[PDB]
Design a protein around this nucleic acid. Sequence first.
RNA 1: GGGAUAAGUGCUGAAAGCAUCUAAGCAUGAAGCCCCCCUCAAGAUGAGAUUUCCCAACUUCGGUUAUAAGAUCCCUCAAAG
RNA 2: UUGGCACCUCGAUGUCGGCUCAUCGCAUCCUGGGGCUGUAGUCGGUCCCAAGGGUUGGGCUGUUCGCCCAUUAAAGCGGUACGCGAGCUGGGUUCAGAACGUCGUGAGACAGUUCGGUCCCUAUCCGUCGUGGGCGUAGGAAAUUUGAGAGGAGCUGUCCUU
RNA 3: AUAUGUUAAGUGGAAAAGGAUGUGGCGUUGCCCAGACAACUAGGAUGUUGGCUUAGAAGCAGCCAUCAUUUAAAGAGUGCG
Lengths: 215, 122, 37, 175
Amino acid sequence: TKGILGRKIGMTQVFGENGELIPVTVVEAKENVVLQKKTVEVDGYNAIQVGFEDKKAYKKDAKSNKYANKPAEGHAKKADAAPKRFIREFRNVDVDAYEVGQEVSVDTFVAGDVIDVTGVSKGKGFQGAIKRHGQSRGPMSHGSHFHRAPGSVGMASDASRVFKGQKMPGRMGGNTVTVQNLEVVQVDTENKVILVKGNVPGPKKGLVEIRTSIK
Amino acid sequence: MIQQETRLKVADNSGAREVLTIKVLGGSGRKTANIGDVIVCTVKNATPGGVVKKGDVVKAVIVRTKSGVRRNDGSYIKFDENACVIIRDDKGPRGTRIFGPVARELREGNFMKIVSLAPEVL
Amino acid sequence: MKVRPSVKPICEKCKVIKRKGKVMVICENPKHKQRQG
Amino acid sequence: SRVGKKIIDIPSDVTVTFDGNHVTVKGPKGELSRTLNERMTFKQEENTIEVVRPSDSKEDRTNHGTTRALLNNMVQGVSQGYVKVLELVGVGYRAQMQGKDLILNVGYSHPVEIKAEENITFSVEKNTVVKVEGISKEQVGALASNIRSVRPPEPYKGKGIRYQGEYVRRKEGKT
RNA sequence: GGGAUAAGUGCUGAAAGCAUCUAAGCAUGAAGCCCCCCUCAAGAUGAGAUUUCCCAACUUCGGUUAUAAGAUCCCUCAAAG
RNA sequence: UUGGCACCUCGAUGUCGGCUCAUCGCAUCCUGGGGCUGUAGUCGGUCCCAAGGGUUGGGCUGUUCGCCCAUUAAAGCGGUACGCGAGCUGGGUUCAGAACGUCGUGAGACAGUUCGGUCCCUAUCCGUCGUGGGCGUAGGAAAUUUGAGAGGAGCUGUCCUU
RNA sequence: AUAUGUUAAGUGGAAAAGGAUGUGGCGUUGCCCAGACAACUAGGAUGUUGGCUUAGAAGCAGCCAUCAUUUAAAGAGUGCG
Ligand SMILES: [Mg+2]
Ligand SMILES: [Mg+2]
Ligand SMILES: [Mg+2]
Ligand SMILES: [Mg+2]
Ligand SMILES: [Mg+2]
Ligand SMILES: [Mg+2]
Ligand SMILES: [Mg+2]
Ligand SMILES: [Mg+2]
Ligand SMILES: [Mg+2]
Ligand SMILES: [Mg+2]
């Protein structure tokens, strides 16, 4: 139950009972609609899909993504809706609720719900082994020429190859990751925000997936 | 942050003036300590007389780190030196004349005797 | 349970049986439990 | 197989009904059903059952004498009913019924609930003697072995869930 | 938290009138095993599925001419490199 | 392991430790489950099942080792060219200097010490870590997905009640 | 593929001292409808533990001395003790 889409606004803090400071990630979970209901009788699995942030309609000479194209008009026309930038399926929800076209508002969560927040990472670029992985660097003095290299990559001639999973350098990367068992502390209905306790992955104005905890 | 081989002032009349840490007891691999953490330590500068003497290996609790502790209300506390009280392996001290301010965060570590023998606790 | 290649009766009240492909001995005192291995 | 030559298995008002491959036994406390065997054949001549093995082989000699015991123990707990009595020993061990399910207090930090199943009634006499009653000897032996996996007997004092006539091997271990 | 199990623990039970944890059955049993959890995944050449959009003529239709939906070049950029 | 043998390599298979990065066995060091006990309890002992995960920081020695101080639930044992130098150091040692002891008439020698003593390589292929292009997937597109599979995770103390 | 067997461990598709039966084949043998082999339960004795009697010990520290029969039948107790 209880999935929603938003985007990271930033990070603040809130005081609670007996003055306890608790860190807070403001998520603007605005203008989410139920956009297609999926059934096991048609697809094999039960889910809805929620479109998050509406963008401008079809324009003939459109050269960028903020004007929808003709497949995204007709897809968001089968629901009485505007075309959305982000579209995600939620299959933990109950499919027998959520009529197609429902504005799934921000007051589906109450202060104190446990949730999972899914987002991409920041993305750091090409990084080395002691930054991409938590590797111990070599000594910076005493004659050494090994500082920030990876170490040995194998054994000599039994295993005359490098095994995969070696943890070599490359792209640190914005990949999807969930932080689990976060709390909702404050739902502002008029501002359409959620204050989730802690930090969620991604940069600012990113995209989150707040759904309830499977644990 | 108090690790192995940090010199700490000794904050009572247990017989020691300076002490250096051997290990931070607790778990395995435990690197640092703050207020309320018991450390095992050898005294380096000792008062002539008293109880402990130079080269004894004593257990002792951290009071008032220089990199102090954070509280639940988002409050902080920091001190100008690292100090230390030699204890007597039941969370009770050796001396009766504990010097200097003690952080509040060792009331909940059952060091109530160290609090009562101290000046104003903050 | 004494695992040993040489499972034998230790006293006369101990009996020798096969359970699930292995030779065991059963006896009233449990110090004479043996299975062969 | 001298338990297979004595394959009389004398019935009662209990009416044994074959079904070809398997046999249902019904009576005053009835409806047991068991898929027996394929090689062992069956004949009810006048009033009793009979279990006949062909070919005299070792597999036909083992499986025949069991099949007499599988007829005979079906027709005798539907005739009479199987009872296995189990006993508490200890200072403050009190078993009592929660209605249909039984609750033990055997020195743990928590009571132990042995949930009942079909054809099994749990009855407690005087908080230290528990009777398991039923119509099939394997199902009342299985649940009369889960009551004493709660707390088996113990050598130094004897404390734990015993059987009725169990000889608990005891030791004398003193400080 | 589920299943299936190890060592083990059994129930029923012959073979071998008995006994018997096993042979036929029936249970129970571990940080292990399989799920459960997290990622990545139809180049999964078996290339899956759903929803929406687009629909040509010339013309030995050989191919060309154009184009649809859609993209891209190019240009302004960074939450990306 | 110390050896035995002399089969591969002397138109070079280049270095003991340490560092970085590991990986694999289980004859299990801790944690899991059992049997027995000359197991009251608390502790143990011994044996069986099990590799999932974990398995410290210093002092002395170039040391492997070993001793020791502290801890820890435990500080496992092995294999991988006594894993890993076209990844690093070069303390150890087979270089030229010099000195002692000892031996030799001597030049010198020891495998005895002691001080000092240059560590080359722009990665072609395989393999690995990332990342694009092409084509295929019997119309072409845009978007959401199924998961066949593969990978990651997996440790544990203390205290309070009972 | 025929014909006759054997094995149930994937032996086949790597070992030993030993450890056990698991089934084949081939014997020898002593037991038995005067009813054995289990198992059924029923007498289990007695003078008497007799002696050295042994911490008292009266199937038992250890020397056995182990004769008669309450008796259809069992022992100066087979034996658990
Ligand atoms: Mg380091
Ligand atoms: Mg190399
Ligand atoms: Mg032996
Ligand atoms: Mg030769
Ligand atoms: Mg093993
Ligand atoms: Mg090389
Ligand atoms: Mg020289
Ligand atoms: Mg001379
Ligand atoms: Mg120099
Ligand atoms: Mg084999």
